[PDB]
Amino acid sequence: MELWLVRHGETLWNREGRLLGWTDLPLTAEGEAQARRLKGALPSLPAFSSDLLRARRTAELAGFSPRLYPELREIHFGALEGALWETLDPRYKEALLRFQGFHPPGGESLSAFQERVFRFLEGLKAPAVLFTHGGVVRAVLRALGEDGLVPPGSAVAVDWPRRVLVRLA
Numbered sequence: 730m731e732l733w734l735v736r737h738g739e740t741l742w743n744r745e746g747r748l749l750g751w752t753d754l755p756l757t758a759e760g761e762a763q764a765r766r767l768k769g770a771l772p773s774l775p776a777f778s779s780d781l782l783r784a785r786r787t788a789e790l791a792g793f794s795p796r797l798y799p800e801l802r803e804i805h806f807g808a809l810e811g812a813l814w815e816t817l818d819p820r821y822k823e824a825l826l827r828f829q830g831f832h833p834p835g836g837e838s839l840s841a842f843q844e845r846v847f848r849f850l851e852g853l854k855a856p857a858v859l860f861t862h863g864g865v866v867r868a869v870l871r872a873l874g875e876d877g878l879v880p881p882g883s884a885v886a887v888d889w890p891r892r893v894l895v896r897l898a
Contacts, residue, residue: 730853730855730856730888730889730890731856731886731887731888731889731894732850732853732856732857732859732886732887732888732889733771733772733774733856733857733858733859733884733885733886734859734861734865734866734869734879734884734885734886734887735767735771735787735788735791735858735859735860735861735883735884736861736862736863736866736879736880736881736882736883736884737756737760737764737783737784737786737787737860737861737862737881737882738756738757738759738760738761738762738763738764738783738787738881738882739756739757739759739760739763739881739882740754740755740756740757740760740783741754741757742754742811743760743881744757746813746814746815747811747812747813747814748806748809748810748811748812748814748817748833749803749806749810749811750802750803750804750805750806750807750809750810750833750836750864751781751802751803751805751806751810751836752810752811753781753782753783754782754783755782755783755786756782756783756786756787760783760787760881760882761786761790763787763881763882763883764786764787764789764790764791764882765790765791766882767787767790767791767792767882767884768790768791768792769792770897771791771793771858771884771897772856772858773792774855774856774857774858775796775855775856775857775858776788776793776794776795776796776857776858776859776860777795777796777797777798777801777853777857777858777859777860778793778795778796778797778798778801778859778860778861779797779798779799779801779802779803779860779861779862779865780797780798780799780801780802781802781803781862784801784860784861784862785797785860787860787882788860791860793858793860795858795860798849800845800846800848800849801846801849801859801860801861801862801865802861802862802865803861803862803863803864803865804833804836804837804839804842804864805833805836805837805842806833806836807833807834807835807836807837808833808834808835808836809821809833809834809835809836810836821833824839828867828868828871828877842864842868843868843872846865846868846869847868847869847872850869850889850890858884863877863879863881866879866885867879869887869889870885870887870893872890873887873890873891873892873893875892875893879896879898880898883896883897883898884896884897885897
């Protein structure tokens with residue numbers, strides 16, 4: 730099943746090293762510009778989007794009218810929302826980097842987060858474009874055995890649940 734995963738553009742925290750999960754931050758001006766550059770480049774397939782502003786705005790500027798689904802949200806960082814990555818306790822830092830054994834205090838466990846992401850993908854009946862977040866893209870790419878680092882405002886097409894098809898930046 731061909732699925733396009735679009736990581737939303739830049740927000741202030743994405744450029745200042747701060748964890749951004751459920752905090753509803755808007756895209757910066759460049760973040761909006763990154764979204765507009767996607768219009769015409771992404772296939773005009775049915776679109777779904779996280780209900781967070783930054784994702785919805787990316788979908789809109791990319792020329793799509795997505796159906797909103799909370800299951801596509803970034804992981805909730807709870808007490809670590811906005812947390813300065815620099816002073817972030819090594820325990821959480823190491824956990825996020827390895828992508829396991831991570832449950833930000835007050836937020837969602839990585840296991841719960843990944844379960845809702847993969848469950849959402851299972852409900853898709855045809856190719857679609859998903860306006861989502863870095864954590865979501867990473868979870869999907871890691872499951873396929875590949876690096877989940879994709880530039881903000883870029884997209885990766887995958888043939889779920891087998892391999893990566895193409896990385897559009």
